[PDB]
Every structure is written in C-alpha cells, then in structure tokens.
Amino acid sequence: SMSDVAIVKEGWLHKRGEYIKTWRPRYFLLKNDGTFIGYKERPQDVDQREAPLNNFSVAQCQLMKTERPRPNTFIIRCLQWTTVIERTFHVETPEEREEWTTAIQTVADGLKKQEEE
Ligand SMILES: O=P(O)(O)O[C@H]1[C@H](O)[C@@H](OP(=O)(O)O)[C@H](OP(=O)(O)O)[C@@H](OP(=O)(O)O)[C@H]1O
C-alpha cells in the first residue's frame, strides 16, 4: 500500500500546449503506482496535492527524446482511459531529461513486473 504511493521523482518542468503550443511551467510528481501528475503551482499542503491540473498513467508508456522545437525535449506516449495521447515536456539539460525518462521507465517496468506476477 505505502510503497505504491511513494514519490519516485518530483520537480518543475515546462509542458507544451496541445493547441497553443507554448511552454508552460508545471510541477510534476511521479509515483510508484504509475500516476504522473502535474500542478500549476507546487502544492503546499495535502489538499493541494489532491487536486492536480494534469493526471496521466505511465503504464506501458513510450518515452521519446527529441531536440525540436527545443533541445532536451521529451515526449510520453501513454494511454488515457481508452485513448492514446502524447504529451511534450522540456527540462534544461540532457542529464535531467535522462533522469525523468529513466524514472518514468522504471515505474512502468515495475507495473509490468506486478502484472506478470
Ligand atoms: O491549452 P491548449 O493549447 O488549448 O491545450 C490544452 C493544454 O495542452 C492542456 O495542458 P495544460 O493543463 O498543462 O495547460 C491539456 O491538458 P492535459 O494535458 O491535462 O490533458 C488540454 O487537454 P485536455 O485534457 O484534453 O483538455 C489541452 O487541450
């Protein structure tokens, strides 16, 4: 129960709009249960934590590193209920990008091992 809701990684990034393709600052949090949740403002209390702006599930996701429109961009391709979506993110160095994509992949792998169990 508690290991599943551990926070694996959290931090700020920019998230690109889907239609108005601007970079928007968002605070994201990845948990062992595959939830990847974003906030306009970094949450300061539990109530704030419970009300994210963005919520994805990273089970079986794909992780793509790209250099356009900006270097150090990454794309997650994941399932949102029954629709496959892509979301685009940016951090300021390739090392930071690798930290995020590896953490997301580690969580996804964990969920897969749980299934296989
Ligand atoms: O603002 P524009 O360019 O019109 O497009 C919006 C933003 O990309 C939202 O991201 P953000 O909340 O980070 O601004 C996104 O929310 P999600 O990424 O949470 O899905 C909306 O998807 P919808 O969820 O389909 O509304 C999408 O329609």
Swiss-Prot record:
Changing residue 15 to A: Impairs interaction with PtdIns(3,4,5)P3 and PtdIns(3,4)P2. Residues 6-109 form the PH domain. Disulfide bonds join 61-78. The modification N6-acetyllysine is found at residues 15, 21. Changing residue 26 to A: Impairs interaction with PtdIns(3,4,5)P3 and PtdIns(3,4)P2. It is found in: Cytoplasm; Nucleus; Cell membrane; Mitochondrion intermembrane space. 1D-myo-inositol 1,3,4,5-tetrakisphosphate binds at residues 15-20, 24-26, 54, 87. Interacts with BTBD10. Interacts with KCTD20. Interacts (via the C-terminus) with CCDC88A (via its C-terminus). Interacts with GRB10; the interaction leads to GRB10 phosphorylation thus promoting YWHAE-binding. Interacts with AGAP2 (isoform 2/PIKE-A); the interaction occurs in the presence of guanine nucleotides. Interacts with AKTIP. Interacts (via PH domain) with MTCP1, TCL1A and TCL1B. Interacts with CDKN1B; the interaction phosphorylates CDKN1B promoting 14-3-3 binding and cell-cycle progression. Interacts with MAP3K5 and TRAF6. Interacts with BAD, PPP2R5B, STK3 and STK4. Binding of the PH domain to phosphatidylinositol 3,4,5-trisphosphate (PI(3,4,5)P3) following phosphatidylinositol 3-kinase alpha (PIK3CA) activity results in its targeting to the plasma membrane. It is linked to Breast cancer: A common malignancy originating from breast epithelial tissue. Breast neoplasms can be distinguished by their histologic pattern. Invasive ductal carcinoma is by far the most common type. Breast cancer is etiologically and genetically heterogeneous. Important genetic factors have been indicated by familial occurrence and bilateral involvement. Mutations at more than one locus can be involved in different families or even in the same case. Colorectal cancer: A complex disease characterized by malignant lesions arising from the inner wall of the large intestine (the colon) and the rectum. Genetic alterations are often associated with progression from premalignant lesion (adenoma) to invasive adenocarcinoma. Risk factors for cancer of the colon and rectum include colon polyps, long-standing ulcerative colitis, and genetic family history. This is RAC-alpha serine/threonine-protein kinase. It comes from Homo sapiens (Human). The gene is AKT1.
